[PDB]
Design a protein around this ligand. Structure first.
Ligand SMILES: Nc1ncnc2c1ncn2[C@@H]1O[C@H](CSCC[C@H](N)C(=O)O)[C@@H](O)[C@H]1O
Ligand SMILES: [Zn+2]
Ligand SMILES: [Zn+2]
Ligand SMILES: [Zn+2]
Length: 426
């Protein structure tokens, strides 16, 4: 039985609204992707199917590009991998953009005759493209992408005849621009990109009543506050650590709309985000573009050196609550976890808490995860009474954001049970 339903909104295309009263944490929808792929910087670092990052992965024999964690994952990914293998093989070492690879998998799933669970409420053909709202430099960009697709897909596609009508390459790339989902791992690292057309019904807000989490490529939609009958359901398309000037820019350029939400109109939290001197944090912002690029490719040691440079150089002038400084700590923390330097990770991680509490109000999955990491590190250091508080706080959030269907909740409980035992012992 469905608690959500499609409806035409006043002026923001189609939307999704409640059919029944919904309480925080309530599971609204479950979907696997119509199609999905590992994103560029996680390829050969994580498994192509399940998106987990083991020590050694086994490559595909035919192309050597796809990489898997096990035989079971290589078997079950084959249907999706089958008809792209030769294209990956011939292009080497050249890799196409993620959208090209994504669409290459989609185009075949659309001829698949069996109805797609993910398209239950909304199809791929329903997705908004914003054709009539696009600027010239994006149209030109989309034209280049069509050409790349055409050259990348020679071995399997030669002509528009080999694909359904009603499908248009150009139009399809436009859909992709504003209907993509960035699949994140349990750690909240960006590992993939995929299409979930039913979930694409949800309009954006900077103060959403709903949230999504990824458990592997599986997606869960959950309410994050009390929601009344008939109330439109919204999510945030964007990372929380962005100013209202920065949010409006991305939503304009990528989603062809001016955000009119409360937070955008009232500069909500902008002053706290930009605490400190401009001339100082402008440099941090600049350094971040490189930093986030290296983190994308899992280059933890280079990430650390760059983060350490900035932190010790700014300690006397730039406060932590400055989103740019804040992002630098979070990268630095993540680098250390992946590098085994757990003492240091907690030093960095601990400084992010109160800024996160302020910037992630209520229940947000990124915060829940962040508190968990700091709680987990505090457990490893023998700081049992502090870890117990943070892991309980992590649960409070993640009960709402992750729920019992997400497998990370199990891990959290085992940490809490391990911490409770470490407390009762000493
Ligand atoms: N707050 C908002 N204001 C105006 N338009 C919005 C919006 N949030 C989302 N949209 C629109 O929805 C698109 C994202 S997909 C959301 C579903 C879309 N309304 C549809 O009918 O298919 C964006 O490209 C934008 O056109
Ligand atoms: Zn796997
Ligand atoms: Zn292959
Ligand atoms: Zn907004």
């Amino acid at each position: 039985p469905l608690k959500v339903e499609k409806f035409a909104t006043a002026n923001r295309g189609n939307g999704l609204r409640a059919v029944t009263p919904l309480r925080p944490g309530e599971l609204l929808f479950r979907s696997d992707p119509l199609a999905y792929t590992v994103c560029k910087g996680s390829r050969g670092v994580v498994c192509d199917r399940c998106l987990l990052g083991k020590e050694k992965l086994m490559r595909c024999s035919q192309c050597r590009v796809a990489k898997y964690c096990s035989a079971k994952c290589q078997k079950k990914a084959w249907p999706d991998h089958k008809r792209e293998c030769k294209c990956l093989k011939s292009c080497k070492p050249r890799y196409p953009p993620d959208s090209v690879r994504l669409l290459g998998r989609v185009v075949f799933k659309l001829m698949d005759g069996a109805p797609s669970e993910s398209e239950k409420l909304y199809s791929f053909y329903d997705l908004e493209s914003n054709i009539n709202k696009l600027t010239e430099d994006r149209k030109e960009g989309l034209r280049q992408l069509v050409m790349t697709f055409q050259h990348f897909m020679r071995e399997e596609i030669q002509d528009a005849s080999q694909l359904p009508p009603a499908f248009d390459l150009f139009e399809a790339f436009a859909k992709v621009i504003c209907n993509s989902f960035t699949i994140c791992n349990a750690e909240m690292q960006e590992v993939g990109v995929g299409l979930y057309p039913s979930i694409s019904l949800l309009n954006h807000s900077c103060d959403p009543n709903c949230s999504i989490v990824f458990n592997g490529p599986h997606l869960l939609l959950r309410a994050v506050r009390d929601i009344e009958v008939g109330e439109e359901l919204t999510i945030c398309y964007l990372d929380m650590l962005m100013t209202s000037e920065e949010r409006r820019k991305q939503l304009r350029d990528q989603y062809c709309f001016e955000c009119d939400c409360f937070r955008c109109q009232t500069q909500d939290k902008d002053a706290d985000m930009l605490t400190g001197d401009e001339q100082v944090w402008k440099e941090v912002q600049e350094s971040l573009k490189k930093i986030e690029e290296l983190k994308a490719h899992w280059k933890w040691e280079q990430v650390l050196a760059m983060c350490q440079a900035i932190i010790s150089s700014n300690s006397e002038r730039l406060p932590d609550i400055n989103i740019y400084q804040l992002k630098v700590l979070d990268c630095a923390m993540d680098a250390c976890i992946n590098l085994g330097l757990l003492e240091e990770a907690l030093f960095y991680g601990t400084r992010t808490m109160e800024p996160y509490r302020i910037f992630f109000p209520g229940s947000h999955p990124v915060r829940g995860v962040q508190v968990m990491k700091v709680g987990k590190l505090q457990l490893h250091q023998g700081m049992f009474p502090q870890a117990m508080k943070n892991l309980r706080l992590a649960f409070d959030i993640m009960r709402v954001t992750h729920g019992r269907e997400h497998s990370l909740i199990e891990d959290l409980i085992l940490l809490l049970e391990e911490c409770d035992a470490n407390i009762r012992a000493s």
